[PDB]
Amino acid sequence: AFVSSGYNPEKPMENRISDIGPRHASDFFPPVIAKNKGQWLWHEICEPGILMHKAESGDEVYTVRCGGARLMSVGHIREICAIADKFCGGHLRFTTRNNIEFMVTTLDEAKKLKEYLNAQKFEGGSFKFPVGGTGAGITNIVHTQGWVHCHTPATDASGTVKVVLDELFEEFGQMRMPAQVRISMACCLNMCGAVHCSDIAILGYHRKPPVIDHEWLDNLCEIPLAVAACPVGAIRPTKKEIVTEKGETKTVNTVAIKNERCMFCGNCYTMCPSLPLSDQTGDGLVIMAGGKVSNRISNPKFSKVVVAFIPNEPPRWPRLASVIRQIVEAYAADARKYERVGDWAERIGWERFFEKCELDFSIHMIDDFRDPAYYTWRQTTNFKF
Amino acid sequence: AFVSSGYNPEKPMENRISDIGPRHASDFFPPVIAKNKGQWLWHEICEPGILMHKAESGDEVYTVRCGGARLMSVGHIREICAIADKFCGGHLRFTTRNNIEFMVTTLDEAKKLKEYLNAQKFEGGSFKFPVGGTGAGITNIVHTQGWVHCHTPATDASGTVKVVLDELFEEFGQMRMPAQVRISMACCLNMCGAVHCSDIAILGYHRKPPVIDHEWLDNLCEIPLAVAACPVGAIRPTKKEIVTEKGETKTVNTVAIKNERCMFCGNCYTMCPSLPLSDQTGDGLVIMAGGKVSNRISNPKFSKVVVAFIPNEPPRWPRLASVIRQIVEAYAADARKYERVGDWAERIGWERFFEKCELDFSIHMIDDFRDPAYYTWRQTTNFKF
Amino acid sequence: AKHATPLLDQLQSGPWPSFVADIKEEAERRHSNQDNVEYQIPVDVCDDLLGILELKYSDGTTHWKHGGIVGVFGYGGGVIGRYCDQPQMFPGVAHFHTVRVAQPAGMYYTTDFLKQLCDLWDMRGSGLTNMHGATGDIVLLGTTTPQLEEFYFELTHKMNNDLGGSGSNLRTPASCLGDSRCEWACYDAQELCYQMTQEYQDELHRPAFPYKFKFKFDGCPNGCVASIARSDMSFIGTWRDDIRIDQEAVAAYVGGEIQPNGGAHSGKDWGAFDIQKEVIDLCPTECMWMEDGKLQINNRECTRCMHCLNVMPRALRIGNDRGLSILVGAKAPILDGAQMGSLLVPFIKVEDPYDEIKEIIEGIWEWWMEEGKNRERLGELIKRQGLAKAIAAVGLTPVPQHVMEPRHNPYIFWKEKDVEGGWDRDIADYRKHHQR
Amino acid sequence: AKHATPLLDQLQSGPWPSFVADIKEEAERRHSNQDNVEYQIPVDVCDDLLGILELKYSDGTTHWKHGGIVGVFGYGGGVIGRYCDQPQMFPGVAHFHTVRVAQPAGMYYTTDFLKQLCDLWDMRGSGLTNMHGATGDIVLLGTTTPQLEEFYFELTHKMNNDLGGSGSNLRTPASCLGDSRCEWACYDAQELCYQMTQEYQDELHRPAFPYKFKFKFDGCPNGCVASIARSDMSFIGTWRDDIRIDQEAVAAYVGGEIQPNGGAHSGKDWGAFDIQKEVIDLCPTECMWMEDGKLQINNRECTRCMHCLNVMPRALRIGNDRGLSILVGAKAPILDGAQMGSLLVPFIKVEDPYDEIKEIIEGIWEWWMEEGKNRERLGELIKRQGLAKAIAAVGLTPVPQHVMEPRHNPYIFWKEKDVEGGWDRDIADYRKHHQR
Amino acid sequence: AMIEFKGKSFEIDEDGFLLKFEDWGPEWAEYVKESEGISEITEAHQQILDFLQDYYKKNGIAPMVRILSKSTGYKLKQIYELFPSGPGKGACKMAGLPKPTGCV
Amino acid sequence: AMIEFKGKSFEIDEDGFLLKFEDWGPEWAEYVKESEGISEITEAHQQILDFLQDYYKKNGIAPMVRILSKSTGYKLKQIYELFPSGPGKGACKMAGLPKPTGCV
Numbered sequence A, B: 001a002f003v004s005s006g007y008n009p010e011k012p013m014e015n016r017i018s019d020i021g022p023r024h025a026s027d028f029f030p031p032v033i034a035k036n037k038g039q040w041l042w043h044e045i046c047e048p049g050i051l052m053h054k055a056e057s058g059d060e061v062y063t064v065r066c067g068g069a070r071l072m073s074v075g076h077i078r079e080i081c082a083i084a085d086k087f088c089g090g091h092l093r094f095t096t097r098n099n100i101e102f103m104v105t106t107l108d109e110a111k112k113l114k115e116y117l118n119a120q121k122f123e124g125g126s127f128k129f130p131v132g133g134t135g136a137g138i139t140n141i142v143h144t145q146g147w148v149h150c151h152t153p154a155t156d157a158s159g160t161v162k163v164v165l166d167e168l169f170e171e172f173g174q175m176r177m178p179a180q181v182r183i184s185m186a187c188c189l190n191m192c193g194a195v196h197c198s199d200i201a202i203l204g205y206h207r208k209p210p211v212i213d214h215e216w217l218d219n220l221c222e223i224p225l226a227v228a229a230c231p232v233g234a235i236r237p238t239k240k241e242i243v244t245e246k247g248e249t250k251t252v253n254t255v256a257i258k259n260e261r262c263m264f265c266g267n268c269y270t271m272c273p274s275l276p277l278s279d280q281t282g283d284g285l286v287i288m289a290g291g292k293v294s295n296r297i298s299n300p301k302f303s304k305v306v307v308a309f310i311p312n313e314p315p316r317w318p319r320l321a322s323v324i325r326q327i328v329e330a331y332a333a334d335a336r337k338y339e340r341v342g343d344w345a346e347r348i349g350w351e352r353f354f355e356k357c358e359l360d361f362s363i364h365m366i367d368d369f370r371d372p373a374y375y376t377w378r379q380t381t382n383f384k385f
Numbered sequence C, D: 001a002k003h004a005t006p007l008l009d010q011l012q013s014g015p016w017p018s019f020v021a022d023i024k025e026e027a028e029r030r031h032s033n034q035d036n037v038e039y040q041i042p043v044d045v046c047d048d049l050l051g052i053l054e055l056k057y058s059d060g061t062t063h064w065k066h067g068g069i070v071g072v073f074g075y076g077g078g079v080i081g082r083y084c085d086q087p088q089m090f091p092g093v094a095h096f097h098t099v100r101v102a103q104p105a106g107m108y109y110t111t112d113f114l115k116q117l118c119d120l121w122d123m124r125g126s127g128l129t130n131m132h133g134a135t136g137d138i139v140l141l142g143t144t145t146p147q148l149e150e151f152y153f154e155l156t157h158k159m160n161n162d163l164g165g166s167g168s169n170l171r172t173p174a175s176c177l178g179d180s181r182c183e184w185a186c187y188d189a190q191e192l193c194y195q196m197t198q199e200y201q202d203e204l205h206r207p208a209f210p211y212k213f214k215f216k217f218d219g220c221p222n223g224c225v226a227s228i229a230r231s232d233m234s235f236i237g238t239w240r241d242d243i244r245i246d247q248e249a250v251a252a253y254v255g256g257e258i259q260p261n262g263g264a265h266s267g268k269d270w271g272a273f274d275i276q277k278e279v280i281d282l283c284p285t286e287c288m289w290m291e292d293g294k295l296q297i298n299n300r301e302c303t304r305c306m307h308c309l310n311v312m313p314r315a316l317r318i319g320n321d322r323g324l325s326i327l328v329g330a331k332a333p334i335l336d337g338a339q340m341g342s343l344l345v346p347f348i349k350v351e352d353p354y355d356e357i358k359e360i361i362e363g364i365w366e367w368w369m370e371e372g373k374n375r376e377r378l379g380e381l382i383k384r385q386g387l388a389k390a391i392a393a394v395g396l397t398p399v400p401q402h403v404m405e406p407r408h409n410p411y412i413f414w415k416e417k418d419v420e421g422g423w424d425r426d427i428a429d430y431r432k433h434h435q436r
Numbered sequence E, F: 001a002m003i004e005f006k007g008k009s010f011e012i013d014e015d016g017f018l019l020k021f022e023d024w025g026p027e028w029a030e031y032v033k034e035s036e037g038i039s040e041i042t043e044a045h046q047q048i049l050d051f052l053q054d055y056y057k058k059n060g061i062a063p064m065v066r067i068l069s070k071s072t073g074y075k076l077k078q079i080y081e082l083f084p085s086g087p088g089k090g091a092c093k094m095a096g097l098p099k100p101t102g103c104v
Ligand code: SRM
Pocket: B143, B144, B145, B149, B150, B151, B152, B190, B191, B192, B193, B194, B270, D067, D080, D082, D098, D100, D130, D132, D133, D134, D135, D136, D137, D138, D139, D164, D172, D212, D214, D229, D230, D231, D330, D331, D332, D333, D334, D335, D377, F102, F103, F104
């Protein structure tokens, strides 16, 4: 059942094509895009999920945007192509937030395409291709590998995202927010996307120090890398007498970790297989808010800690769904036009953010990391009661 | 010639009064202050150097403020008392900025006192009691010991302050600034006063590492204190073979300092007499700007480095006089009403402060101290050309 | 259904496209196998993925072993190897490697190309993907070690496409869609992205660096690929001349004839457009005013934040004198803290073959490759050796634009050559003037 | 005169009172000795001071030896000993110690008191002072060791005054002039300052601490004694109820009958007062508005910055519900960087005998005296062990007001007792679920 | 998994790295070369192998790529000619060092 | 300045401190005691002096006041009862330690 491609394991470097890079995007442009590239004059959102661009030539292009799960079967891709073959001359694109975009020539075609895409359903009732993600609404959630593929997660990406987008679904295909809300997710603090810079961010968090596999550590780890992996100097080299699984007694090179000095970042485990830390009841979620990358009005912002722990509750994470909705609702009701969540929080003051969003505040929100922590505290009598 | 006070050196703890603290201010209030304390209703500046307060009773007090050199002889105090006895029923106060204040009960008495005060001159022509310091002008300069009394200065407080107040003199008795300008001065970076938090600040700076007195270091210094004294870890304990100034070869405990790692703060000298660093051509001044302590509109601000180096030029420091004036003139011409120097600078952007004030910019202004340095760089494309 | 999935089953309902429904669909297609594909990895790969994932939902911890070192000959990265930690229970994901496939800039495709890729992955992998990876790659999720070279061979020979990057190398560069479909692109961002990817193929395929490095290319300050937060070297378009104003179009906004912000807020009642409240009063530098019904802008004082253009796309346009700024150092927290890009090059012209941009890139790399410690990002090296060193390395001189603010702590280093008399001082010279 | 002073002579001209002119006068009054004072230190002390200062101007470096440990029995600080480094050239300043003398709060004096102190210092010291030291003390500049006890004896016995502080102790506390002559004083700043100074006389006279500690008392947020930048513990007045508005006085400002800001800006033409421009549009929380010619304030959203009050003293007054905030950790750069006070207690009542305030002061000291390293300021202890510890030390629980903003780096410590199951984990439990 | 090669026993992981460095034999490299596209171990290969073992023995880590180049005189391009999988998957594996870790 | 006390001689600064700790002798404390307001050096004075000297010999610094108290059991008030100038100017001087430095 093994079928060779032409590759020859005994002559591995023969007919090896390499260093050819990606394809050039012009291989794939719709004709209207190829023709008008660089000559775009202005745009408009015709209605949720439908954009129009006017070119200098007078040409128009209509883009219809729909949601995507990011994680996706070939059968799903093949169905995206079928759609594009029927309506869009075989062209399509994906966005930087992993929505899907189909381009057509007139408003009438775009409206028909939206109505078609909105009709498509998976078994179980979920929309295959829900239309929206434009203007001042809530768009797709940028997210990571979680338990589908990564070994350092503290939570699941695809699950938490499915949960939050169900919860907020009605806001995807509408434009009622003070500004578009970017929600992101990362399953550990490596943050493999946008958590550190989103309006609301969901972050997989550990609350327990590594469990040390002493018998294997020196065999599987470069000990000095594990020591250097620690942002807080909690790890140090040492020798130790142990009894192996076989019941033999020997002394190994290993590490010692001062538990009171560890803050569960997981970085020593990235460097060293013998320092795993994942734990069912310890692991959960941190929520952050107020970050952004645009330079519009205000300068890019980091997102800040606003919830210290929500437990993991697979498969439906209700407390998560509840907390996000609660933040989004307070923001949508109070913030001024064009304000991002962070603009809002900073203007009213974080003391008012916590009260409007009905969030608890603790020890955990107060920066204590090196000399910059100092700056985050309040060096003024300008506060609200 | 020795005259005993009644103290008995043979019985030092007998007849010893101690732990009695300051006098209570109520020992010294003018009658109108004592009557109305706690009941003040409003104030107005009648004219440069003349304040009036209205009390709930209807009572008025007029305060006349005039300059003080801070450093002063007993003969100058007695002259201050003469004035107070003749005009003020023997009462007076000094301000937190070391101006002198005399209180009277009517505007006409205040006007007569201003006129009398302004007429008093030292031999050489300097005003003894120039009236001003109120409202939106430039007030007294808070400053330190310099070469009059301290062992760690890199410059002179009394001289530099005289030079700058001569230069800006006309703004003391006038109210033409967008807001009252607080200029401060410290002769080393211990900053004994308000340098880190003033509109414009003058700071004695060193530019050369300590000269180590190896022969005496271990005898005169607690070595580990000197080592721990360094903010950037440039000092380490060591042994060293030396030829003493007697001609004896011997090996001592001492320190070694990595020159390329020292930034001349002077703190190891504060801890260790064998580490002097003062230097005629190396020592000079740094200028800082844009700090403030009030909470009015904006939060309290640190002052920022705006001139890397002005040389010491005793006795008249003309480059200094010239630079402060230049900063002041750009601020007075450009800033909006109520803007402190930091308000102005941050609003227009430091890129425009440097251009407007015609100051050079160099490596020296760019923060490079620990992790906080990063936050001072520009993480945005919001800049002006 | 090879495994019971009762937790995962709860994510089949609700409106958002269900990754569970989809993966279940794909497992059924492989089982039916109605196009007669000679599947090269276990047929029930998707079933076992659902099973192991269900186990994770049950016990709340990951079930992938640590790490994995796999790849294709000639390349030091491109594939993230992975092995399940319960291979007997879930033989179908015993090997479950991800292949990172280089994407076109702006992620435009034809169905021709995607169908080709699907046929390939159907046969030789799991038939599961991510579109797209956060860095921008086409992600093909799950295959076996023996199939890595076979897939690569077809990808290069039949498809003319390469792998993307992983490891301590130049990672896959991404751009916003640039001038393909946006009126604000200040340079051909897709082109510069492509061309930089091609220029540095060796640094991407063969890890040469102290750590990872990323490029991202935004056509204007809106930051639609988020380069300022997610690339070590971030490239962001601007212009340096005047905003172009169409006054008649201004008058049409004022008169209610065009919705502000291209209709972005049409789902809520925010009142009729008020240019004074929505534009003039929100401009961060207060550099705009209305005069006799015409908009005026003091462009010298404009920081090009994009606000007014975003509110009024039909009346305001970018300037004609265009280029980009370059910002360095962005990265996630570990080790020393999260960073966004710090301005390094305020303005540089963009012009094929982009020699001047290549000089910045290579000057930065030359510095970081010598001085960078193991696993030290550029941002961390900038903090270690200082922004001034970065400025020196690309051959610039410090300008006020290099900071948001000058330092406040006065711990200031001087070079010896800049200090009169230097540092060579004798204690005897000092003692001559100052008694012990 | 005794020494040529060609450099210093240049500072006799120009309009600002000349410290040179004054010291020359004093030197002359000593030489003349019109009152037959039996001078206890060298007659020519001021001539030698000018001489050595001139030498400093000439060679650009200080001529005081390092340090000096002198004082009076019972006390471990109060006097700063100093010895010139050329005693043969300048025997008049061979000993030149400074005595720090406790000042009344708000620095009010009668001539009775000042004249008496001048008599004393004229005889036993140099006849030179600073009025005042930056921390607040009356500074008497220059005497000899044997005279320290003599002066102290007369100061205490005849004048009923004490020394101020120096060393690793509580330093002399200072205050703004508070409610003696200001309509904004939110509490009796002078009285609290006095009463704290008396309460902790022992901690001031006998250094007991890891380092120095300072108190300063500001009557309101304008900060006329700069406590937020210049005291380890900073006490700054506010109110928590409504600003009181006299609408008639508002109308008078609007009508041009009262100069804004008490006439502070009268030296320049800024135009007629415009309440919208100078008050409403500048309020940092945007909580004010004019309605039918009346000023309205949404007090819940006022941060008490003082601006509107400072502009309209005759129309706006502080609220009736008064107290103070306490902020901790201000300090100059050495060692770890400049700090200003960080909010610790947002609001506390001020009421003799001030038990609550004493409880905070002593909570902080108990913590810092135990944990503080040698020469670590409170503010540095707060950076080292964290704000949460300071908050616990005074029996408070963290509130959002404790931070300008929440942390962005997610390196968040947890206490074991707060984490379900705790930290006692065996690798064997883990390996039962996850194959190596 | 346990494997047998020319009467010698080695413990290995899924990637073919040697689990225990103390278990190294001169046979290890010969067992590995086929999977790593190497016909025969040349002197150049051996110099690289020897340096890696020696560097791991001394320092407890693998060397950075720039350290390996400068210490052996082989440029990166030449390492790939010798070891087609690169210095990590090829050379470090052949030398009997631990799998490289981190975000590979 | 050099001084002679009971046929032994010591080098001292303007403040009465011993310039060189190795130049110490049992007569040092007795030379000083007068200028520090002490009639006789009792056992309690001596426990403090010995402690200061041991601590300096071992650590190269004077001890913090907190450490002096916890190590000798004398509270600050008692130290002042024994040494009226306090632990720095009295005890440290009498012990032959270097003069305290910093912002005294
Ligand atoms: C040491 C020395 N100081 Fe001084 N100092 C006075 C006042 C201040 C203030 C402002 C204030 O108290 O309102 C500050 C800044 C706030 C703060 O406390 O940090 C200040 C700083 C310092 C430092 C830095 C401390 C740190 O970085 O944490 C040191 C170094 C150190 O502690 O090791 C230091 N100071 N200081 C004021 C006191 C007069 C009074 O009693 O009111 C000054 C006499 C300044 C003035 O001209 O008014 C003064 C000066 C001094 C130095 C003695 C000068 C003399 O010869 O008399 C001294 C003691 C340096 C020394 O002898 O080692």
